[PDB]
Paper text:
The quaternary human Polε–PCNA–DNA–dTTP structure contains the incoming dTTP that base-pairs with the template in the polymerase site and has the finger domain in the closed conformation. We refer to this structure as the “nucleotide bound state”. The high-quality map allowed us to build an atomic model for the quaternary complex. In the nucleotide bound state, the P-domain, the thumb domain, and the C-terminal PIP motif of catalytic POLE1-NTD each interact with a separate PCNA protomer. In the case of the P-domain interacting with PCNA-1 (PCNA protomer-1), the ends of two P-domain α-helices insert into the PCNA-1 PIP-binding pocket, with His-684, Arg-685, Gln-689, Tyr-726, and Lys-729 forming five hydrogen bonds (H-bonds) with PCNA-1 Asp-257, Pro-253, His-44, Lys-254, and Asp-41, respectively. In the case of the thumb domain interacting with PCNA-2 (PCNA protomer-2), two short thumb loops insert into the PCNA-2 PIP-binding pocket, with thumb residues Glu-1085 and Ser-1117 forming two H-bonds with PCNA-2 Tyr-211 and Ile-255, respectively. The PIP motif of Polε adopts a short 310 helix and inserts into the hydrophobic PIP-binding pocket of PCNA-3. The extended β-strand following the PIP motif interacts with the PCNA-3 interdomain connecting loop (IDCL) to form a two-stranded β-sheet. Inside the catalytic pocket, the incoming dTTP has well-defined EM density and forms a base-pair with an adenine of the template strand. The dTTP triphosphate inserts between the palm and finger to H-bond with the main chain nitrogen atom of Ala-629 of the palm and the finger side chains of Arg-765, Lys-769, Lys-809, and Asn-813.
Residue numbers in the entry:
A (entry chain A): 24 to 182, 212 to 1198
B (entry chain D), C (entry chain B), D (entry chain C): 1 to 261
Amino acid sequence: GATSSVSALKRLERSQWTDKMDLRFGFERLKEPGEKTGWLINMHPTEILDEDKRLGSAVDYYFIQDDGSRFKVALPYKPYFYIATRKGCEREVSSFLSKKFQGKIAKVETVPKEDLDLPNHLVGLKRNYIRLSFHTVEDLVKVRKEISPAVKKNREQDHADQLDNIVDMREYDVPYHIRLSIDLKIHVAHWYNVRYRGNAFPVEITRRDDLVERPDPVVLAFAIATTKLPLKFPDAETDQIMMISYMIDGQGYLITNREIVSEDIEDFEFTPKPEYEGPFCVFNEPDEAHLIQRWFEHVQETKPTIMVTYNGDFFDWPFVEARAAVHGLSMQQEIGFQKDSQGEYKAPQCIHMDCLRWVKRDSYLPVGSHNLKAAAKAKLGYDPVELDPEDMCRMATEQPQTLATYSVSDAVATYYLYMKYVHPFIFALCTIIPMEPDEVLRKGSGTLCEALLMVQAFHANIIFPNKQEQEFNKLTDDGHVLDSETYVGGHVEALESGVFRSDIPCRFRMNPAAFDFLLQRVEKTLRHALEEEEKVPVEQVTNFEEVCDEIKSKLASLKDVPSRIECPLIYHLDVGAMYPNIILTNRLQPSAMVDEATCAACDFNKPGANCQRKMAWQWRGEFMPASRSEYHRIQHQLESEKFPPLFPEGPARAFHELSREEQAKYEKRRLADYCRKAYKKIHITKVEERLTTICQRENSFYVDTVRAFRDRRYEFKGLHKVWKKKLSAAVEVGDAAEVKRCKNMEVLYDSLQLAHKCILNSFYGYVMRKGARWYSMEMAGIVCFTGANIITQARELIEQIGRPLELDTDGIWCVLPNSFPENFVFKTTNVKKPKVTISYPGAMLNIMVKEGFTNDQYQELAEPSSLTYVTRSENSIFFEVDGPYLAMILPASKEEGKKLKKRYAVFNEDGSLAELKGFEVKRRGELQLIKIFQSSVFEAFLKGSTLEEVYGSVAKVADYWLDVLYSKAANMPDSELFELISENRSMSRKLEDYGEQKSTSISTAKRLAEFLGDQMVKDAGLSCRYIISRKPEGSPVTERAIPLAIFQAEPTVRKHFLRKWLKSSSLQDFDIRAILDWDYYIERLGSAIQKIITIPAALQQVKNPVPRVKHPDWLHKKLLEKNDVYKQKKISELFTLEGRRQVTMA
Amino acid sequence: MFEARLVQGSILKKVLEALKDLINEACWDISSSGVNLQSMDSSHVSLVQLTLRSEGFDTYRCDRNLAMGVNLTSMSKILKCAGNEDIITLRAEDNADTLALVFEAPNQEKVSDYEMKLMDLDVEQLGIPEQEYSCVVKMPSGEFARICRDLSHIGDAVVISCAKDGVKFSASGELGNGNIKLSQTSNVDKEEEAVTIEMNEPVQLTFALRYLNFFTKATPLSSTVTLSMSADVPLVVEYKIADMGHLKYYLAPKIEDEEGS
Amino acid sequence: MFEARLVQGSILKKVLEALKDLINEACWDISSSGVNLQSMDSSHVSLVQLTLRSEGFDTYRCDRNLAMGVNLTSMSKILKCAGNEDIITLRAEDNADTLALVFEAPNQEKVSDYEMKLMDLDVEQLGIPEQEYSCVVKMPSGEFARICRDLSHIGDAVVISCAKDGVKFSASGELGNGNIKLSQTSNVDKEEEAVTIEMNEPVQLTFALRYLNFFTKATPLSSTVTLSMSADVPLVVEYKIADMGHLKYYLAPKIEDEEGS
Amino acid sequence: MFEARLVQGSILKKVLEALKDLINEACWDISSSGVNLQSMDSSHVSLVQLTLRSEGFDTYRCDRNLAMGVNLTSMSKILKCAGNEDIITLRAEDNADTLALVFEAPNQEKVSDYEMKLMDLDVEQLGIPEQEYSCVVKMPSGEFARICRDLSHIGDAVVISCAKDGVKFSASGELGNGNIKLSQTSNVDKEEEAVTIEMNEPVQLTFALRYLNFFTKATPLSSTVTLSMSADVPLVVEYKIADMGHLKYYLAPKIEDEEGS
DNA sequence: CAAAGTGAAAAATCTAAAGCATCACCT
DNA sequence: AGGTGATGCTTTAGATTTTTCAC
Ligand SMILES: Cc1cn([C@H]2C[C@H](O)[C@@H](COP(=O)(O)OP(=O)(O)OP(=O)(O)O)O2)c(=O)[nH]c1=O
Ligand code: SF4
Ligand SMILES: [Mg+2]
């Protein structure tokens, strides 16, 4: 009534303020009738008033024209969801819902759609749902909250008559923004014609395809640098912002303070690369209010329609907004920027892109290289090398020269990272993903995959399956309560350990039967690698046998000597997108994951039905040892007991008033305590083998979506491949003017295919996230077990020729003989492809794949609505061969029967680093001693013509660093000592969520809290860097974890903190070396050396490279058993065996 | 069916405690002469024989021959629940997979009955030849357990060398070496205390000390132990369990292989 | 005001060592009729009643009914400092922040007063009924501790059955099926090694074996333990102390869901 | 050329069992007058002093004070092989890199020759002067085995206040304030249970109790422990090894430093 | 309200199962 | 000084947690 009228008045005030904000920043409404051409940049759900005096929402589409003019069009659409209905009675429920929501819905129509979960849904059977269209988004939220308890009640019921017949409302969590992008195909980064013919006629939009080029939008890259209290977390209540540096379309503008900044800042030029240029011109306004005012006027003058920064949702925009609220001028009322409900700040008039929301998701970078200062190295190919981080920064910050250098640095990098990697990739995403660039950059990869599948399902006219919820306290078939339900994923084994160079000869133990069957397989291998790899030389090859006879001669000439010492060929037989290609080979959809009852419900369960693929997977479940009777007993006793009230001094809560999350959190702890007190154990791990079918007749929207995204990724990968071949052509000849062009272009395409790879692998990951429309227990496990089978059969094939070394769920790292055939060139009379290069090991692996892993159940509808379900045999799972590498180094474990998996170092042929995977160098923080050791010790692994000399060089590097770690500070200064032994650790959670839990990071966070305030620990993502002390001897590692922020302050405010946690109030030394645990750091470096060098040397039959590091006791026992001349005999050898008898049951 | 009745129930516990630590899965047998077992370890280094004669038991009931593949890693946990001085009754059926163990208190009141499931086993049976040992030493078992547990802290290679002066148990290791000499008794009349030696030729063999530690968990089984050895012949560790039976431990030696020649 | 004194001061040490492992916190309930303890374990399936009589103390003087918040792990590891024969005296104020307990030697050579910090928690009192029991068994403590520690090796759930033949403790598991049988012991009449039963109905239940292992840390409390068990009533492990009341452990039996229900 | 003989074999065994967990490696400085041993801790807090003269040795023959770098864990492994009453003979030659630890049985039926390996190292000593210690507390070690490891269960940092009435060790910890008090109490003046306090001046001194638990492993070595302390002087806990020797420990005193200083 | 999986190293703490050094009676 | 069972002090074997790489 009166409160609803003032809510509509507030919403109309919101809309008029939004249009005034739009008109200030360009973006005129289309009041004049006519036709205009625009490039869509922005969308937001705002409210509008039509001619019927009704307040409805309208997504305000923003366009940029070719001349630079921009305009805003609010297309009015009515938000909706879909509702289900039990039977054909659809008019009465529609009338009942229309006659009591007469001022809050718009129109009701019955909608035919196809759902994946229906039995017999492939004969041409559809389920008819109901549209309910409202007026506003707030109308949608209020009606959804009003009718949403009926969802839970009608779901729980399983055994006003026109109100209770509804089964389940569908597509209610879908945003109105996302919905309007999906419905009328209005995607960002496309060209459109906008026609307005008055307020009575709705505005019409049409796609325009004859224009393909992109315009140049105004892109702002601002980043601030603020002084603060020394070594504190960023808070805006202490002082103000010194400098903001911001670029306008490759032209940077900087505004500085003058009342605190000493030097009047002059102008300079930044040249990191010829590609990245900023023609700066600086302003020198005197006051901080005038700083923000100059920023407001320059943003209003330039009218930026894309605005990028470093950590805008976390540091920058809260700081400037708190400063603006202090100084009086409102950030919202000036530029549209207010904090929204998720902590992200969204203008109605602009685009916000945090580069971390692209780096942390799509860049495939280590988290230790997630900031801008290290993502510049990994993307732009340049390093900001400015100054020392201590002396010229922490106390010499009065120097405005250095301050402006850093300010320009934090702006050029974000601007050019956007323009080069985030702008084209994110708008190429936005062309297909139905979201604005803020949402595309900010949502998860699973949400991006859900959006892409949502477009494909709406294009196929498929209703969107409901967002599932995480079930609590899942039950095993016997009755145990499941802690976690998992599948067995990829198969990782490290088979060998040691350095395998291609210049040192190594022993091969191939059986002759492998070469005997390869001799007859040669013709098939070259025919398959000439047909399926490149389609053009199908039968046009001239010298088809003139190389094949040489191949057979080379393969059979050294078959006569199977056991042979020879130099190896380090070959990476890698599959290209094995998870998407297994999906694309087997038609693996989460909709297609089908069981026996649902196949029996289908009408196409023929006796010769070639429509079920019965691939298997390995289920895995950890469950409590307590049984179902104990679970019922503890549930009853928890139901009897009264819970404490939620409200302060409120009514007591029973069992049926608490939520399911609270009940599960109570029951988990109260059952785990009973399990530890009554069963000796809490988690029993069980691995189960199970197999389910895949319906090959089903709708292929998931397969089409992953095929379209894999074709996009493979278009970018083919561009990467042809530019890599261009770089290989431009190498080994003199330097030209296009070598750097080829290198940067191949780096850009490698980044592009990695960024598309993240979404493509998140297609596999999407079926295993909470709140997924297309969740599947079986599908991801099936794809992992199929990849495991592929790689273990490749290991079985390789182990009969050479030695497989590192099995991951990628491919085989192996060594093959030098006399094995290799990359040979095949000539062809076709002008398009005169020469085709084909490698032999990938060819025989691809023939193994074609013989066993091919799919003859590939029912694909050639013509829809005709049941012409033809069957093909597409493999597309190819083993791409990486080149013959120089060396491969693998580490070994410190215990018997175990090996370090997912960890190796591979070098390219020119001595360069090809791969360094799994190590602690790339990991965030860790010990910098470990990082320095593992980054410097592998360059010596290429030095030496034999294993003993190679291990001696590696031992020289290791001993040198051990001599440093023992006789520290011979000439080695305290500053690099301090920055050498630091260990950085970061927490995902808050310190108050780490209560009653002991860890080194938790203890040093508590130490930092009781050192300088709790406001360091009230926020998540705390980076604590520390050392492990030793002065309270006998105390554990957690009680001796001590931060490094106490050896920087004054003695009067550091001696108390030195004497508190060292349990020594009488101590006097201020040196860090007395506090440091020498034995702990010796043991850490010794364990690293044992894993890298000494234990693999013992496995490759070298005595000991590093005599300072001892061996484990089992390895010492094996070495002493091998060294001595005495031997173990057997009773079976000494006394004559009577015979092996069998003793059976009685 | 197999029925056994043993008054002094301590010996059976020590027999099993001597067989827990060395054999994970052994094979048992019943004949008319008594209960005998013969099985090896997982590394095929030591053969183990225990023969308990029929008339030594309190009463013996033998019907046929049964081969029993009981796990000895679980037998002295269902048998560890016995006192030493209680009577032990063993029942094994002809065609059932249950082995019944009953313990009776001397007060004839506390009766503990248990059943143990049986399973198949594939163990090589090895024939024992009769060999004339060049050396025989008859030593108290506490001294031999002490000697192997004391030399176990030195190394794993044990050199058993007997010459005309006496018997040497020699071991060497990373912390040094230890060789311990035992001399013949001359004025000792007790059978359980005196040590006697029989010689044909001085022997010099080398064994594994961990297996000698695993052998000597039969220490209060008998107050004496007989060790007989010969060149290129496995050493025997004979524990004479009163008149009840005997327990033999066969140990494969270490001789030097002439790799140069 | 609180003042108490007992010469035989080891009884408090024994009951606190028995209550250390099971219950973490407790509430000391004070009255002229009797001093009550009523605590629940952390898994909330075991209930504890420890009653100490007022007249059993040598000197006792309390003016009103008081409540005390105490964790028994700290109280047990602070009571273990006393010997086996020292005289205990307990002291407190009405609402003090400390509990004063003093140990004095019989020869007055070691007077030791301990002050510990109490913790104020919610004091919950649940009046349980002393329901009449179908079966009681007065049997020694060490024999029951032996029964629990022997059945713990073979299984994890004890099927306790009693009838006219006596009492029976059965188990099952991965090793096998075992049972311990005890008769009426009516032939002899001993003051400590006697197992006397009283039955109105032969009733059998199943219990948790590790909970029985936590219960039988009260072995040095007395040489006679009264197990009380009836159908759908918790088992009462009553330890009767001479003129100091009793300590009862209550364990919920596993009345499992019947397949025919 | 250096030899020594002891009929008492338990003294060296107990002095190695009480010293292995404190010092890993120490140098034995055996002189002509007897066995002297100063030993710094691995964490560089304490000094341990041993003084074993030649009056209790069977035969003593020393020429030069040699320093032998015996590793304590290895020697405690090897001195474990000695018997409780067995005769221990240690022998060192002029050019012997090894140490010949020879054990003789009391029946003279065995010779047990152990060669333990030695490595050479050089350290420096500073000695300790003689002071006047105010408070000397002679007290039975078997009760210190119940006092120290039970006071360390409730608190680490404990203080020692001394007076004419007696000595009080006050345990401050998370559990509370733990006071034990011991007086003279010469009513029954027993020979070994004689709590005698030689009192000169009242001193309050603070100490740690994991560390004071680490000297109290030598309670079977001696019969009574005397400890002497004074104003800001390091504590000397002493033990009396029969009439053979004495075992002293030097604990540097812990001072609670004030914030205002 | 939004949030892609699993495998694995690396270390750090938390438990319990053994190994092994002393006590409750009888000549 | 020798014979049985507890009873407590180290030692080691896994179990569990948490970042942050691999795939
Ligand atoms: C990197 C990554 C891989 N995977 C899975 C999917 C991949 O098929 C498999 C191996 O991926 P990768 O070998 O790293 O990449 P790719 O196989 O998809 O393509 P290419 O080899 O040409 O670079 O691991 C994920 O599920 N998530 C991920 O983040
Ligand atoms: S797999 Fe075959 S039988 Fe099963 S649902 Fe699909 S078409 Fe029907
Ligand atoms: Mg791959």
